[PDB]
Amino acid sequence: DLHDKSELTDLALANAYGQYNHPFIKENIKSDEISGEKDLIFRNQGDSGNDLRVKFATADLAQKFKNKNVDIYGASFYYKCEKISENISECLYGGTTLNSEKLAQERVIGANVWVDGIQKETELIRTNKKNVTLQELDIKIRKILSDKYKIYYKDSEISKGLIEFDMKTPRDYSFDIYDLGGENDYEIDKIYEDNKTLKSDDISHIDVNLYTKK
Numbered sequence: 001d002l003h004d005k006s007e008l009t010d011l012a013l014a015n016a017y018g019q020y021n022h023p024f025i026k027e028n029i030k031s032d033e034i035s036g037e038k039d040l041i042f043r044n045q046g047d048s049g050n051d052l053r054v055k056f057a058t059a060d061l062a063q064k065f066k067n068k069n070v071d072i073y074g075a076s077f078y079y080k081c082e083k084i085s086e087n088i089s090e091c092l093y094g095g096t097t098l099n100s101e102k103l104a105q106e107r108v109i110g111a112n113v114w115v116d117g118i119q120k121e122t123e124l125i126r127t128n129k130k131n132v133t134l135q136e137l138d139i140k141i142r143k144i145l146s147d148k149y150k151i152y153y154k155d156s157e158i159s160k161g162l163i164e165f166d167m168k169t170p171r172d173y174s175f176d177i178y179d180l181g182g183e184n185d186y187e188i189d190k191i192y193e194d195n196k197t198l199k200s201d202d203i204s205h206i207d208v209n210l211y212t213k214k
Ligand SMILES: [Zn+2]
Pocket: 112, 166, 205, 206, 207
């Protein structure tokens, strides 16, 4: 069931590596401009003053954040990002939460890691948001995985990977780290388009299982 790293093109690997190592993080910005019916526009708010277009799965979502002070944390990209002006538009799916919703205290989540069934050091990620997007937690975990296990380097020994985010109830979410939508970010990141958010204090822990080349 777990997809193999060898299934991905070089473009897909370079793109994955790029976004999990350089996420777009912006705090307290507001947009009173919808594009299409489900994209919010933050002119000149992206990298290099490029414009920023945050895409949502529904107009329901875009409206919810329209004219709200929001925090952004997601995987950004340019290719296929619909321009709003004659200037370069930078894109990102979901990764949006209200800036007013901060925890009374920093939530640290433990991430157990296994490589071929052998327990490695438990890793840590944290957030100060009451409702954190799954995208944010995922990027934070993949960053550590990229740093320590070189998950997105073509010639590293890791070839299969599963990340499990467990709640305090029997609810869990998971990502096969190599089952990418396609090779371009506009495809790959639709994985975050629903802006799925989790109640930070209800998260139990993360379980990561990687398997070496075979
Ligand atoms: Zn566990």
